[PDB]
Amino acid sequence: TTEIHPSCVTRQKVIGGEVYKGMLKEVPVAIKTLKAGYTEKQRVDFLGEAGIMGQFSHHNIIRLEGVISKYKPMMIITEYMENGALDKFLREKDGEFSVLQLVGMLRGIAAGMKYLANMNYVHRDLAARNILVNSNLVCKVSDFGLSRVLEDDPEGKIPIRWTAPEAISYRKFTSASDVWSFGIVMWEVMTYGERPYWELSNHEVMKAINDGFRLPTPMDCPSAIYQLMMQCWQQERARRPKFADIVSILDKLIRAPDSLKTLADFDPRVSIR
Numbered sequence: 001t002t003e004i005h006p007s008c009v010t011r012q013k014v015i016g017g018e019v020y021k022g023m024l025k026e027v028p029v030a031i032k033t034l035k036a037g038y039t040e041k042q043r044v045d046f047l048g049e050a051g052i053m054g055q056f057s058h059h060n061i062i063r064l065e066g067v068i069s070k071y072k073p074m075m076i077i078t079e080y081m082e083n084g085a086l087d088k089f090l091r092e093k094d095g096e097f098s099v100l101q102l103v104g105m106l107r108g109i110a111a112g113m114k115y116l117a118n119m120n121y122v123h124r125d126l127a128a129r130n131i132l133v134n135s136n137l138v139c140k141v142s143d144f145g146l147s148r149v150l151e152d153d154p155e156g157k158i159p160i161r162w163t164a165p166e167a168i169s170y171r172k173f174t175s176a177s178d179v180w181s182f183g184i185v186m187w188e189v190m191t192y193g194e195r196p197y198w199e200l201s202n203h204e205v206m207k208a209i210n211d212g213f214r215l216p217t218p219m220d221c222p223s224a225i226y227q228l229m230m231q232c233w234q235q236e237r238a239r240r241p242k243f244a245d246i247v248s249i250l251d252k253l254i255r256a257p258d259s260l261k262t263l264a265d266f267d268p269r270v271s272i273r
């Protein structure tokens with residue numbers, strides 16, 4: 001990792017220790033701080049995140065500019081993504097993109113995830129809230145925090161309803177549980193940030209999934225896209241596509257965009273006579 005001198009960094013606005021938007025000697029950056037009195041574990045997790053990010057060089061993975069580790073407070077400095085987190089972005093831009101644009105976002109995320117998987121990195125917390133969007137509509141995987149627990153664990157919280165059954169039931173997180181999560185992200189994108197499973201409780205979601213229920217088709221969703229997210233949600237990991245398969249399929253759909261005009265039937269929850 002590049003060590004950056006503090007005189008080269010100006011913090012400006014809190015966008016999230018805190019996360020600031022700032023300027024780096026000038027390019028816009030995001031800046032994550034570690035406050036005084038941090039523990040050894042905090043330091044290893046914090047610098048650990050920078051270490052992992054520094055190992056990656058891919059269009060669809062947030063780029064590390066560098067770290068401040070020789071001076072306090074310590075900082076991680078990344079590229080700045082002008083449109084912020086994908087979940088909030090979709091919800092504030094409801095209906096404003098083409099289906100081709102939405103599918104192109106998902107291709108970008110899948111390409112990032114394929115790279116992570118092949119670099120032997122399991123994300124464990126893939127969700128639209130952990131994807132960032134730039135002014136070219138490029139989606140990039142973010143959140144490489146080391147210290148993550150599944151929420152509601154008897155023994156950062158990973159939410160149940162984005163997580164694959166095997167990861168919940170016996171703590172088996174793999175690139176195949178990340179594919180499950182990616183299927184949920186597909187549904188988030190195609191619904192402009194609808195909350196998966198609505199007001200169902202965690203227990204209700206888990207029971208539904210184990211009984212074979214799956215999220216219904218988004219409105220105006222290409223048949224091929226719904227089929228692909230459904231395959232991501234196979235109970236049996238071996239029947240899920242790999243990210244390599246997902247990228248291949250999305251690339252084919254984008255290159256033959258009339259393929260996306262065939263829509264999955266939408267089951268209307270209310271009909272009007």
Ligand SMILES: CNc1ncc2cc(-c3cc(C(F)(F)F)ccc3Cl)c(=O)n(CCCCN)c2n1
Nearest residue numbers: 016019030031032078080081084085142143144
């Ligand atoms: C709004 N635009 C914007 N642009 C770029 C970033 C980069 C980071 C980031 C990510 C990592 C790592 F590792 F997780 F990828 C590390 C360090 C940083 Cl600074 C970040 O935390 N935020 C804030 C997200 C708030 C959304 N809940 C960003 N926000």
